[PDB]
Nucleic acid binder design. Sequence first.
DNA 1: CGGCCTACG
DNA 2: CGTAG
DNA 3: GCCG
Length: 327
Amino acid sequence: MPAYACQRPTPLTHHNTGLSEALEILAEAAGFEGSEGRLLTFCRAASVLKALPSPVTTLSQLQGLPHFGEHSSRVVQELLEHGVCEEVERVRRSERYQTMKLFTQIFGVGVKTADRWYREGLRTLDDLREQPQKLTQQQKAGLQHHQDLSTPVLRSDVDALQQVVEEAVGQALPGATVTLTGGFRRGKLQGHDVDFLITHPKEGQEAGLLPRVMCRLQDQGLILYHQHAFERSFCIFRLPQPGSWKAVRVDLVVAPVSQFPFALLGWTGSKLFQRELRRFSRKEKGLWLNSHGLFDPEQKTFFQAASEEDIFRHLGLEYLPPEQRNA
DNA sequence: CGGCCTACG
DNA sequence: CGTAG
DNA sequence: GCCG
Ligand SMILES: [Cl-]
Ligand SMILES: [Mn+2]
Ligand SMILES: [Mn+2]
Ligand SMILES: [Mn+2]
Ligand SMILES: [Mn+2]
Ligand code: NA
Ligand code: NA
């Protein structure tokens, strides 16, 4: 079992679902208390279990597995013995956890905002609605649309949304392309948002594209919310439904064709996979990776990539298709 | 022990 | 501060 | 919380 998640296939579905879910509760809880290191370890340990070829049935099967020490091993031990880990259940039940989860799930609210609101004694969505003078425009949108945004986005929704984005992109800039990214590209059947990456085969033609796309979607009556030389737009779309509609989070991202493979890689995820890939790149290969490129700080050069395959090769990693990047 | 991804709005 | 994967 |  390699130590970095980018060095091993991680399928969407696996053989240790219960165990990984328990560790991810602890990861999430650590994030709520500002401990990113503990979040990372619990996330990595969970991801290791996702990568195993069969279920863990005994404690001995953890021996030698990366990211399993005293704490994560105890969590697994208690689940194997009793079907439940008391620490995990204590977190699930805490007012702190439930409220921080509720608040941080609001679009426009991060851990810091949620925590300050928690400390001020606020607990419910109606508590926030009663004092809306404090809220940002983004948080107001997040709160108004919260119910719809909690409903899973389905594959049918994605196909509908892709068509309308293509229509607007085609008018904004003939020849421009739209690629589905994020969780749906990794094979997920549901999600909480749809991610698209837009480019054009002629380098430079994509300049100024996103405002033109946004203005056109706005005029078609499809934009319930957006933030406005920008390249990422976090929107709430109005998606047609039987006799009605629902609000759906959509991210639209633009990259020049030179950067497309890096942007595609970054935006396809998973979040943990990409953090691990960037960590690997820097620590093991001395190369700096982001969604724009891959930089050699010795030679002071950028690696030209024509594909995701190119990027894995330049990092000395076996290629993983998107459906094996579910770390 | 230090490090933990790296960006844009 | 928020957002993204 | 774990690793390297
Ligand atoms: Cl016991
Ligand atoms: Mn997504
Ligand atoms: Mn998104
Ligand atoms: Mn996300
Ligand atoms: Mn994400
Ligand atoms: Na949030
Ligand atoms: Na850019």
